[PDB]
Amino acid sequence: GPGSDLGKKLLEAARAGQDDEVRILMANGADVNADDNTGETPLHLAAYEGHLEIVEVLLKTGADVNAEDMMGFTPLHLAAAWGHLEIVEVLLKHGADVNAQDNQGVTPLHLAAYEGHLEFVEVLLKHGADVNAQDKFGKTPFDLAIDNGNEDIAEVLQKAAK
C-alpha cells in the first residue's frame, strides 16, 4: 500500500544507524511499526544494532515496545542478547515486557543468564524478571547459566528464587 517504501527506508535507516534519516522519514509519515522480511520492526533493528539514539526517537514517535518478530523476539530480547544495557533500560522504562517469551519459551533473563552478563541479570531481576520461567526444554535461566559456567549468575539467580 501507500507508504510501504517509506517503511522499508525506515527499517534500513534504523538498522544502519542513520539518525537524521530516521527523523526525516518519521516527519514524512513513515510507519514506525512497519516490519521487514523476518518481522523485525525498526525498534527491533535499532535495539539489535545498539543504536540508542534511534531507539529513543522510535519510542517517542510511537514504536510498539512489545512487537514480536517471526522468532517471537521483542526488542528487549535482542538488546539483552547483544549487550546493550542502556537500551535494555530505556526499553523497560517504556513498558517492555520483561518476561516476554519467544517461540521457544526463552525470556530476556534466559538470554542474559546464558550470555554471562551479571549486570544484565540484576537489571532484569530488579524489573521483575521471572526466575522460574521454563523454555521449550524445561530449562530455567539458572539451568542456562550453570550449563555455561556462569556460576556467579547461577548463585544470584538461586538467591532470587527464595
Binding site: 523485525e40 518478530d69 519467544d102 517461540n103
Partner: peptide
C-alpha cells in the same frame, strides 16, 4: 549450537 539470537536465528538452532 552457538550463535547469538538474531532476526533469522533462534536461540535453539540445531547443534
Amino acid at each position: 549450537k552457538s550463535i547469538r539470537i538474531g532476526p533469522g536465528q533462534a536461540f535453539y538452532a540445531x547443534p
